[PDB]
Amino acid sequence: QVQFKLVLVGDGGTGKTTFVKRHLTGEFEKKYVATLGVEVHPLVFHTNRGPIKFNVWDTAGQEKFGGLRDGYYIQAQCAIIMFDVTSRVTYKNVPNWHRDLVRVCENIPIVLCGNKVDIKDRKVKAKSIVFHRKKNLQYYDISAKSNYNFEKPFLWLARKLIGDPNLEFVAMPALAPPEVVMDPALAAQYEHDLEVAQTTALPDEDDDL
Amino acid sequence: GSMEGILDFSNDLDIALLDQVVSTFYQGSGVQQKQAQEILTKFQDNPDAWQKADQILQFSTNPQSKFIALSILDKLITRKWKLLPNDHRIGIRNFVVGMIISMCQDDEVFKTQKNLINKSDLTLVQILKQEWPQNWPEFIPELIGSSSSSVNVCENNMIVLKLLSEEVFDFSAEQMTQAKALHLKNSMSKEFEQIFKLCFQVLEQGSSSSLIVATLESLLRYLHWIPYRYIYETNILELLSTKFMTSPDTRAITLKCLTEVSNLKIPQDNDLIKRQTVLFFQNTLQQIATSVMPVTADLKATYANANGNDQSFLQDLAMFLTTYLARNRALLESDESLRELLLNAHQYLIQLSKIEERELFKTTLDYWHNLVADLFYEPLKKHIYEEICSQLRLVIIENMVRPETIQLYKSEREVLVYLTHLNVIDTEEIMISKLARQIDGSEWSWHNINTLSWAIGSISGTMSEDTEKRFVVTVIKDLLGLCEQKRGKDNKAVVASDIMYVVGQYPRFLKAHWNFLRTVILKLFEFMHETHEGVQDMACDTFIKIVQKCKYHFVIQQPRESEPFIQTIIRDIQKTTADLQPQQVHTFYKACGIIISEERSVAERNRLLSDLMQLPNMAWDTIVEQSTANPTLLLDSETVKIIANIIKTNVAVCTSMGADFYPQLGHIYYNMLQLYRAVSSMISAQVAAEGLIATKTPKVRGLRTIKKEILKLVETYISKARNLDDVVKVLVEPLLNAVLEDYMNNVPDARDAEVLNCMTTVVEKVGHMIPQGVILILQSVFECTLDMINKDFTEYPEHRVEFYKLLKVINEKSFAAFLELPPAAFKLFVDAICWAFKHNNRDVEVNGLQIALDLVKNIERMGNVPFANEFHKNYFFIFVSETFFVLTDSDHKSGFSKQALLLMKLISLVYDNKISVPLYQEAEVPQGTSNQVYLSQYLANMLSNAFPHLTSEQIASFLSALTKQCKDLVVFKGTLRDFLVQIKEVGGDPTDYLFAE
Amino acid sequence: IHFEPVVTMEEDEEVLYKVRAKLFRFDADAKEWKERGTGDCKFLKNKKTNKVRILMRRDKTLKICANHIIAPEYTLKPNVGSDRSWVYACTADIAEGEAEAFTFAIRFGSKENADKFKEEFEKAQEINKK
Amino acid sequence: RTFDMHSLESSLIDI
Ligand SMILES: Nc1nc2c(ncn2[C@@H]2O[C@H](COP(=O)(O)OP(=O)(O)NP(=O)(O)O)[C@@H](O)[C@H]2O)c(=O)[nH]1
Ligand SMILES: [Cl-]
Ligand SMILES: [Mg+2]
| Residue partners of B570: CB distance under 8 A and separation at least 6 | B592, B608, B611, B612
Number of structural domains chain B divides into: 1
Looking at beta carbons, which residues of chain A come within 8 Å of B41?
A: 37, 67-68
Q: Does A208 touch chain B (CB under 8 A)?
A: no
Q: Identify which ligand lies nearest to the alpha carbon of B236.
A: 2
A74 touches B64 (CB < 8 A)? yes
β-partners of residue C22 are C38, C107
DSSP character at residue A178: P
Do the chains contact at D5 and B473, CB–CB below 8 Å?
A: no
d(CA A209, CA C117): 14
Q: What are phi and psi of B790, to 5 degrees?
A: -105, 15
B391 touches B351 (CB < 8 A)? no
Looking at beta carbons, which residues of chain B come within 8 Å of D7?
A: 519, 522-523
Query: Which of A32, A40, A62, A64 for a ligand 1 pocket mutation test, highest count of atoms within 8 Å of Cβ?
Result: A32
Residue B305 is which amino acid?
Answer: N
Pairing of strands A138-141, A110-115: parallel
Exposed, middle or buried: residue B148 (CB in 10 Å: 0-12, 13-18, 19+)?
A: exposed
C104: Cα separation from own chain's centroid: 10
The DSSP element (H or E) to which C92 belongs, if any, is strand C85-93
Q: Is the CB of A125 under 6 A from ligand 1?
A: no
Q: Which domain holds residue B471?
A: 1-997
d(CA A42, CA A24): 8
Looking at beta carbons, which residues of chain B come within 8 Å of A159?
A: 306
List gaps in chain C by the residue before each (C–N > 2.5 Å).
Answer: 7
Residue A203 is which amino acid?
Answer: P
The strands making up C100-108's β-sheet, listed across from edge to edge, are: C64-69, C52-57, C32-46, C13-27, C100-108, C85-93
Q: Which long-range contacts (CB under 8 A, 24 or more apart) does A126-130 make?
A: A126/B407, A127/B407, A128/A91, A129/A91
C98 touches C113 (CB < 8 A)? no
- Which residue of C lies nearest to B700 if distances are taken between CA atoms? C81
Distances (CA, A) of B553 to B56, B267, B509, B593, B603: 84, 58, 12, 14, 19
A94 marked as part of a ligand binding site = no
Resolution value, angstrom units: 2.1
Q: Does B698 touch chain C (CB under 8 A)?
A: yes
d(CA B230, ligand 2 centre) in Å: 5
- B115 vs A74, A136, A205: nearest CB: A74
Buried b (16+ CB within 10 A) or exposed e, B242-266: ebbbeeeebbbbbbbbbbbbbebeb
User: Which of B471, B474, B483, B531 to probe by mutation at the D interface, max D CB count within 10 Å?
Assistant: B483
Give the chains touching A; criterion: ≥3 Cβ pairs < 8 Å: B, C
β-partners of residue C66 are C56
C37 touches C23 (CB < 8 A)? yes
A181 marked as part of a ligand binding site = no
β-partners of residue C55 are C42, C67
d(CA C36, CA B750): 30
d(CA B488, CA B882): 69
- Residue owning the nearest CA to atom 7 of ligand 1: A15
Secondary structure (DSSP) of B404-415:
--HHHHHHHHHH
Q: Is the CB of A15 under 6 A from ligand 1?
A: yes
B830 touches B788 (CB < 8 A)? no
Smallest Cα–Cα separation from C44: which of C22, C20, C16? C16
Q: Identify which ligand lies nearest to the alpha carbon of B232.
A: 2
d(CA C64, ligand 1 centre) in Å: 25
d(CA B712, CA B756): 11
Nearest Cα of chain B lies from the Cα of D1 at a distance, in angstroms, of 10
One-letter-per-residue 3-state SS of B817-866: HHHCCCHHHHHHHHHHHHHHHCCCCHHHHHHHHHHHHHHHHHHHHHCCCH
- Residue owning the nearest CA to atom 14 of ligand 1: A15
Max Cα distance, chain A (Å): 65
Which 3 state secondary structure label does DSSP give B991?
Answer: helix
Smallest Cα–Cα separation from A78: which of A37, A133, A138? A138
Q: Does B805 touch chain A (CB under 8 A)?
A: no
d(CA B229, ligand 2 centre) in Å: 6
List gaps in chain D by the residue before each (C–N > 2.5 Å).
Answer: none
| CATH code of the domain containing A95 | 3.40.50.300
β-partners of residue C17 are C43
d(CA B165, CA A99): 13
d(CA B907, CA B914): 10
Exposed, middle or buried: residue B989 (CB in 10 Å: 0-12, 13-18, 19+)?
A: middle
Solved by what technique?
A: X-ray
Buried b (16+ CB within 10 A) or exposed e, B943-982: beeeeeebeeebbbbbbebbbbbbeeeebbbbbbbbbbbb
Query: Which residue blocks in chain D are alpha helix, DSSP H?
Result: 6-13
B178 touches B978 (CB < 8 A)? yes
d(CA B6, CA B35): 13
- B71 vs A32, A40, A71: nearest CB: A71
Instruction: Give the other-Cβ count within 10 Å of B298's Cβ.
Output: 13
Which 3 state secondary structure label does DSSP give A115?
Answer: strand
The DSSP element (H or E) to which B613 belongs, if any, is none
Give the number of A-B residue pairs with CB atoms closer than 8 Å. 81
Which 3 state secondary structure label does DSSP give C42?
Answer: strand
d(CA B467, CA B464): 5
Do the chains contact at B37 and A70, CB–CB below 8 Å?
A: no
From the alpha carbon of A28, which atom of ligand 1 is closest?
29
A13 marked as part of a ligand binding site = yes
Query: Residues, chain B, total?
Result: 997
Distances (CA, A) of A96 to A61, A140, B209, B622, B911: 12, 19, 29, 65, 39
Nearest Cα of chain D lies from the Cα of B519 at a distance, in angstroms, of 6
Number of structural domains chain A divides into: 1
- Cis previous bond, B133, omega within 30: yes
At CB < 8 Å, which residues of chain C contact B? 80-83
Which 3 state secondary structure label does DSSP give B759?
Answer: helix
Max Cα distance, chain B (Å): 104
A86 marked as part of a ligand binding site = no
Q: What are phi and psi of B962, to 5 degrees?
A: -55, -45
- D8 vs B492, B523, B532: nearest CB: B523
C56 touches C40 (CB < 8 A)? yes
Buried b (16+ CB within 10 A) or exposed e, B651-667: bbbbbbbbebbbebbeb
Q: Is the CB of A90 under 6 A from ligand 1?
A: no
Which 3 state secondary structure label does DSSP give A38?
Answer: strand
d(CA B263, CA B245): 19
Q: What are phi and psi of B704, to 5 degrees?
A: -70, -25
A109 touches A118 (CB < 8 A)? no
- Residue owning the nearest CA to atom 25 of ligand 1: A35
d(CA A111, CA A1): 24
Query: Residues, chain A, total?
Result: 209
Exposed, middle or buried: residue C48 (CB in 10 Å: 0-12, 13-18, 19+)?
A: exposed
Give the number of A-C residue pairs with CB atoms closer than 8 Å. 134
Q: Which residues surround ligand 2, an ion (CB under 5 A)?
A: B 229
C30: Cα separation from own chain's centroid: 24
Do the chains contact at C33 and A151, CB–CB below 8 Å?
A: no
The DSSP element (H or E) to which A77 belongs, if any, is none
C50 touches C127 (CB < 8 A)? yes
d(CA B473, CA B453): 14
d(CA B487, CA B473): 23
Helix (DSSP H) and strand (DSSP E) numbers for chain C: 1, 6
One-letter-per-residue 3-state SS of C45-67: EECCCCCEEEEEECCCCCCEEEE
B40 touches B25 (CB < 8 A)? yes
A51 touches A2 (CB < 8 A)? yes
CATH number of C1-130: 2.30.29.30
Distances (CA, A) of B245 to B34, B238, B327, B339, B340: 47, 10, 22, 23, 20
C20 touches C57 (CB < 8 A)? no
Q: Identify which ligand lies nearest to the alpha carbon of B230.
A: 2
Nearest Cα of chain A lies from the Cα of C3 at a distance, in angstroms, of 30
Query: Which residue blocks in chain A are alpha helix, DSSP H?
Result: 16-25, 88-92, 94-104, 131-135, 152-162, 187-198
Residue B521 is which amino acid?
Answer: I
B714 touches B731 (CB < 8 A)? yes
Q: Is the CB of A18 under 6 A from ligand 1?
A: yes
A55: Cα separation from own chain's centroid: 12
Q: Which domain holds residue A140?
A: 1-209
Nearest Cα of chain D lies from the Cα of B594 at a distance, in angstroms, of 25
Distances (CA, A) of B912 to B383, B426, B858, B865, B970: 64, 68, 17, 17, 19
Which 3 state secondary structure label does DSSP give C13?
Answer: strand
Distances (CA, A) of B416 to A109, B210, B459, B902: 34, 46, 7, 47
SS3 content of chain C, % helix, strand, coil (to 5): 15, 45, 40
Distances (CA, A) of A15 to A21, A34, A72, C57, C78: 10, 10, 19, 24, 33
d(CA A75, CA A57): 11
| Residue partners of B229: CB distance under 8 A and separation at least 6 | none
Nearest Cα of chain A lies from the Cα of C79 at a distance, in angstroms, of 5
Q: What are phi and psi of B412, to 5 degrees?
A: -65, -45
| Residue partners of B109: CB distance under 8 A and separation at least 6 | B102, B103
d(CA B904, CA B852): 12
Q: What are phi and psi of A15, to 5 degrees?
A: 110, 20
d(CA A164, CA A157): 10
B994 touches B956 (CB < 8 A)? no
d(CA B201, ligand 2 centre) in Å: 13
